[PDB]
């Protein structure tokens, strides 16, 4: 398991937590020195538990699929909550079975459906460590509309930060003040599968992408990523989604 406490949290401890989260995910190989997530994992070992504590020391446990860093569901006190999707239904066969009741959230876990439920796109939702504190507190007591926004915060401050050093840094810059995500953050989130695929395809193609990926950079400009010497590949991305799952 991994754990993170918001009480006393600072950019350093958050950075350490994200390092630990990345290193909790299994891999058999690296591609251009980036861990390649496994094609599949059978049984309970498929799920990483993240224990998150809000500033007051109240806690939720979050179940993460280690093949794709997708949040499946979470436990708050004696109630489990799972996304309305087959992968999360499966997860519920393995994690939080001791919960006195299971609520299936009235949406799947993807950004499109979460944004509709929250009534707001990601672009307009501030993120940061204070927002994560808020998100944990919200998830403690069921409210599906509120939970959609909280989960958008949770996903980006944990899974997306694990996937991209740039996003980790953006959250560190928001340790004591929330701010909506940069355009670059959104672009990276939207491109994780595509980047992952092209980096794997580049192996056998001399580091050259079969299909370029268009991102927005930290200055707000369009950039085209065509090969593995790009900073997005050498410094930024930290985990690759296996092409078997794309
Ligand atoms: C053949 C090709 O695409 N080369 C590019 C190069 O021009 C660029 O400087 C580098 C970093 O982005 O990525 C690669
Ligand atoms: N459900 C998730 O954890 C999730 C959603 C969208 C993108 N990445 C992860």
Strand segment tally: 10
Q: What is the name of the CATH topology of the largest domain?
A: Ricin (A subunit), domain 1
Quick one: biggest sheet? 6 strands, mixed
User: For the CA atoms, what is the radius of gyration?
Assistant: 17 Å
CATH class label of the largest domain? Alpha Beta
Helical segment tally?
9
Structural class: alpha+beta
As for the number of domains, it is 2
Strand order of the largest sheet: 1-4-5-6-7-8
CATH architecture of the largest domain: 3-Layer(aba) Sandwich
Query: Helicity, in percent?
Result: 25-40%
Q: Work out the oligomeric state of the chains in this entry.
A: monomer
Active site: 160
Enzyme class: hydrolase
Protein name: Ribosome-inactivating protein momordin I
Family: Belongs to the ribosome-inactivating protein family. Type 1 RIP subfamily.
Explain this structure to me?
The protein has 246 residues and is an alpha+beta fold. It folds into two domains: 1-162, Ricin (A subunit), domain 1 (3-Layer(aba) Sandwich), CATH 3.40.420.10; 163-246, Ricin (A Subunit), domain 2. It is built from nine helices and ten strands. A hairpin with a 2-residue loop joins strand 2 (27-31) and strand 3. Helix 4 (129-139) packs across helix 5. The longest helix has 20 residues, at 144-163. The chain is globular and about 55 Å long. It starts with a strand and ends in a 10-residue tail after the last helix. Bound molecules: 2-acetamido-2-deoxy-beta-D-glucopyranose (NAG) and nicotinamide. 2-acetamido-2-deoxy-beta-D-glucopyranose binds next to strand 10. It is classed as hydrolase. The entry lists the keywords Product, complex, glycosidase, NADP, hydrolase.
């Amino acid at each position: 398991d991994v754990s993170f406490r918001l009480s006393g949290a600072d950019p350093r401890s958050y950075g350490m937590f994200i390092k630990d989260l990345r290193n909790a995910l299994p891999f058999r190989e690296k591609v251009y020195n980036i861990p390649l997530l496994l094609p599949s994992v059978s049984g309970a070992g498929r799920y990483l538990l993240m224990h998150l504590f809000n500033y007051d020391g109240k806690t939720i446990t979050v179940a993460v699929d280690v093949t794709n860093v997708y949040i499946m569901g979470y436990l708050a006190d004696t109630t489990s909550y799972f996304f309305n999707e087959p992968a999360a239904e499966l997860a519920s066969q393995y994690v939080f079975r001791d919960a006195r009741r299971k609520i299936t959230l009235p949406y799947s876990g993807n950004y499109e459906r979460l944004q509709i439920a929250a009534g707001k796109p990601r672009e307009k939702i501030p993120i940061g460590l204070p927002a994560l504190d808020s998100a944990i507190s919200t998830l403690l007591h069921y409210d599906s509309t509120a939970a959609a926004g909280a989960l958008l915060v949770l996903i980006q401050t944990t899974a997306e930060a694990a996937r991209f050093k740039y996003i980790e840094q953006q959250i560190q810059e928001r340790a004591y003040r929330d701010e909506v995500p940069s355009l670059a953050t959104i672009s990276l989130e939207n491109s994780w599968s595509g980047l992952s695929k092209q980096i794997q395809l580049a192996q056998g193609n001399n580091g050259i992408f079969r299909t370029p990926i268009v991102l927005v950079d930290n200055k707000g400009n369009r950039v085209q990523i065509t090969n593995v010497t790009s900073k997005v590949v050498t410094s930024n991305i930290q985990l690759l989604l296996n092409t078997r799952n794309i």
